[PDB]
């Protein structure tokens, strides 16, 4: 999971402090190719049950969230 | 710790706490239950203990201060004059007085941090919180 | 709390005065207790009532009831402890009424049991202690356990058949 974000955004290690100087930003369509290769291991239902779990790994790593719900 | 300048020497006497609230500054506090002479190094022990426990923040309020000179026994004597200023500095602490108060740390993060500090003190103590509104 | 007592067939509780006597098919086993607390058969089963509810009365309550159940289950079917020897060369035999162990010590250990208690050995690396009173069987087996306590490095010694032992292990 760590390598898929590191290759797409262009990260080497991660982040020493995930609260101060951030890392980068990614788009929502990129989440489709991560969950499709990691679908047999997933216990989740369909569509909404896999799109929300992947985004959480970008939190502690330092990669900023794009868009989200409402408006 | 020690004061900057003054008079040099003093005296000694006791009766119940004068100017020591409960709240103000912090959320939780530590209160003396017995009358004592709190040494400079005694406070410096408590500061360091609580300081370590919180790691980063320094949200500790030291309400007491060693504004008092104490003297000592050069080696034996009595035949001769008044004694050495430079033994220690003290804060006269009467029951009720708040010595220390903490900010931002949790209930337990304070119960324990004060428990450790108590063990470095020459007197019985107790932990306190809110509802102290005389003047603000 | 402690309240219900199951009393099958050959039970005969003659709890007169301070001697709370219990006669049955597996010999006569007597057991003494406090008179300050009440005890008698209420038709089919038994009950041990307590007067006060402070603490000194509460403590003797649960104790008095378990001990009567122990004396009841005693004269009913009986008590039997299963012990297991472990370690190279360790073995036990029978010399009449006495148990004889050969467990690593320069001389062989012999244990003559007290009254009502009986020793038995199926395979020479297994000991069986059976008798009337739970305490006497408890002690006798503990004395046999004392002969060699299982060690923290190899568990060699006298253990409780299906007994679990933690192993330190140095070298």
């Amino acid at each position: 999971m760590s390598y898929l974000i590191r290759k797409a955004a262009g990260i080497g290690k991660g982040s020493s402090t995930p609260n101060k100087a951030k890392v980068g930003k990614l788009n929502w369509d990129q989440v489709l190719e991560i969950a499709k290769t990691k679908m047999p291991d997933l216990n989740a239902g369909s569509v909404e049950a896999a799109a929300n779990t992947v985004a959480g790994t970008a939190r502690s790593m330092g990669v900023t969230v794009e868009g989200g719900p409402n408006a | 710790k020690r004061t900057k300048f003054r008079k040099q020497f003093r005296g000694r006497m006791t009766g119940d706490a004068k100017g020591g609230d409960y709240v103000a500054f912090g959320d939780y506090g530590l209160i003396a239950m017995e009358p004592a002479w709190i040494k400079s190094n005694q406070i410096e022990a408590c500061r360091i203990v609580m300081s370590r426990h919180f790691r980063r923040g320094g949200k500790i309020y030291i309400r007491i201060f060693p504004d008092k000179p104490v003297t000592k026994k050069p080696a034996e004597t009595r035949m001769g004059k008044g004694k050495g200023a430079v033994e220690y500095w003290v804060s006269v602490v009467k029951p009720g007085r708040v010595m220390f108060e903490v900010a931002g740390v949790t209930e337990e993060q304070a119960k324990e941090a004060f428990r450790l500090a108590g063990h470095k003190l020459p007197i019985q103590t107790k932990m306190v919180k809110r509802e102290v509104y005389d003047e603000a | 709390g402690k309240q219900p007592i199951a009393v099958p067939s050959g039970v005969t509780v003659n709890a007169q005065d301070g001697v709370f006597k219990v006669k049955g098919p597996k010999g006569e086993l007597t057991v003494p207790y406090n008179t300050e607390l009440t005890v008698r058969q209420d038709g089919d089963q038994l009950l041990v009532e307590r007067p006060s509810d402070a603490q000194k009365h509460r403590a003797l309550h649960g104790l008095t009831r378990t001990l009567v159940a122990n004396a009841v289950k005693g004269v009913s079917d009986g008590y039997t402890i299963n012990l297991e020897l472990r370690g190279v060369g360790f073995r036990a035999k029978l010399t009449g009424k006495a148990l004889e162990m050969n467990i690593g010590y320069s001389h062989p250990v012999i244990i003559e049991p007290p009254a009502g208690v009986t020793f038995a050995v199926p395979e020479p690396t297994r000991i069986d202690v059976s008798g009337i009173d739970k305490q006497l069987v408890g002690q006798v087996a503990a004395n046999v356990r004392k002969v060699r306590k299982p060690d923290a490095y190899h568990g060699k010694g006298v253990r409780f058949v299906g007994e679990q032992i933690a192993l330190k292990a140095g070298k």
Partner: protein, 175 residues
Amino acid sequence: MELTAKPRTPKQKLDESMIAAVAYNKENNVSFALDRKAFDRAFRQQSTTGLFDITVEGGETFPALVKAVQMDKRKRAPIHVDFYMVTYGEPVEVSVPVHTTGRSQGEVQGGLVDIVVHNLQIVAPGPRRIPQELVVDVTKMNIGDHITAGDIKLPEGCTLAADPELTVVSVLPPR
């Protein structure tokens, strides 16, 4: 809130679950003998910002607010209460608890939220129309961010008794 007698001889209440108190406005300055347990249970809910209907011996219901409490040192238990007899249309200056809402984009960064004034003095609100709390947003704050008097929302027709540039909530750095 209920109470009995009122003399200057307090041995009849000393050992008992009672606190000697008073209520004043500019007419009746009535002395008390209220229940310690009841006053404690209730005062902790209402504080100074709140008031309660106090019925004396028999039936004389009066609305009153808590002015000052003089508690015993050594044992933090209160010993004397001062009540202020509420009018109808206009009250006094009331110290209001300054609380916080939401996380700060500075608190998570390295520092922490420090409420300098725990209670705030406010001019002419109106009695029975007094703010029981004082919610203040902190989210906008970083490190070196102060919030003064002229930055706090006052609930309908209320004014600040304290100075315009008096620091209320400041977010402080680490160590």
